[PDB]
Design a protein around this ligand. Structure first.
Ligand code: 42A
Length: 338
């Protein structure tokens, strides 16, 4: 086989010329030359079968990415597994090679308002599709957004995606957790298991702010610190927002806090397009019910020059196990690439 860093990467013969790109996932990601398509591709190696949770995230993701077909969602071009379940140690997900991601890009570049508008548009275009299939991404963040050399954007990492379940959304104060802290909607830390689409919009809202300033807008250092960050900018929620929080621990935590007034975005972002600040405003709304939805976000004037519903597709149809059957389902699900 071939070896990258110091580890076996068994993707011959079609995929050659393996350069190390990074970690994440259940480990290694590499560029490789796809001999059949004569193009370099990304290959991530997964060894998930040791604990159930990785078999779950790997399964969720493969199931979803196979069903999705969208310019702004990453997709899977190939999967390399052993020919028998007994011999299957690893799964190799083959995907398109992308120059960078929004995380790296933000660390080094000032984005123009045109790149911001186009990036945002693409995010929302992709998100519209995902939501229309009734799936939530639940972990949108700049590192989960990949750009190619031509600034084409693709959402990746559906490891934590769930099917939307707004009826089953409620939970107690501080019940936690799992999605990246900085991009978590405030109701995750109060009264939501994050089963509503409004959860993603918040994230996109946080991504938009990060694009305006190259800094995360709510860099809370720990669980509850996140909330005072958010509250610090948006201000104390009103009477009506509070009433929507029936859970007493959460509501009384909010009441115990000192009054903070709203900081206007134009003060936080003096150079930004005012249309962007308006949309920003509607996305980072404390009350998730009052929070804008993806299709109104698309129709917002800030996006006017890209907005075209006939070129913004929706899915043609919508959407607790031992790691044994999981390994077995993964095998069954990866069969079509044998
Ligand atoms: N995971 C994953 C990736 C899928 N495509 C990629 N391109 C550059 C870097 C990482 C990837």
């Amino acid at each position: 086989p071939e070896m990258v860093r110091g580890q076996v990467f068994d993707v011959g013969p079609r995929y050659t010329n393996l350069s190390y790109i990074g970690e994440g996932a259940y480990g290694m990601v590499c560029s490789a030359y796809d001999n059949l398509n004569k193009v370099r591709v990304a290959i991530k190696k997964i060894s998930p079968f040791e604990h159930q949770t990785y078999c779950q995230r790997t399964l969720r993701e493969i199931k979803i990415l196979l069903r999705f077909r969208h310019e702004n969602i990453i997709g899977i071009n190939d999967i390399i597994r052993a020919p028998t379940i007994e011999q299957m140690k690893d799964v190799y997900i083959v995907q398109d090679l992308m120059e960078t991601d929004l995380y790296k890009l933000l660390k080094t570049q000032h984005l123009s308002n045109d790149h911001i508008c186009y990036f945002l548009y693409q995010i929302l275009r992709g998100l519209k599709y995902i939501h229309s299939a009734n799936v939530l991404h639940r972990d949108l963040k700049p590192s989960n957004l990949l750009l190619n050399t031509t600034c084409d954007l693709k959402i990746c990492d559906f490891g934590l995606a769930r099917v939307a379940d707004p009826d089953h959304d409620h939970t107690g104060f501080l019940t936690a957790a799992v999605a990246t802290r900085w991009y978590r909607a405030p109701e995750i830390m109060l009264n939501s298991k994050g089963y509503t689409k409004s959860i993603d919009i918040w994230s996109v809202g946080c991504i938009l702010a990060e694009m305006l300033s190259n800094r995360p807008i709510f860099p809370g250092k720990h669980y509850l610190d996140q909330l005072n960050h958010i509250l610090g900018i948006l201000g104390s929620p009103s009477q009506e927002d509070l009433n929507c929080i029936i859970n007493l621990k959460a509501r009384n935590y909010l009441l115990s806090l000192p009054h903070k007034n709203k900081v206007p975005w134009n003060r936080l972002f003096p150079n930004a397009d005012s249309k962007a600040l308006d949309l920003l405003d509607k996305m980072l709304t404390f009350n998730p019910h009052k929070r804008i939805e993806v299709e109104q976000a698309l129709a917002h004037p800030y996006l006017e020059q890209y907005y075209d519903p006939s070129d913004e597709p929706i899915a043609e149809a919508p959407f607790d196990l031992p790691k044994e059957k999981l390994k077995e389902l993964i095998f069954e699900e990866t069969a079509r690439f044998q």
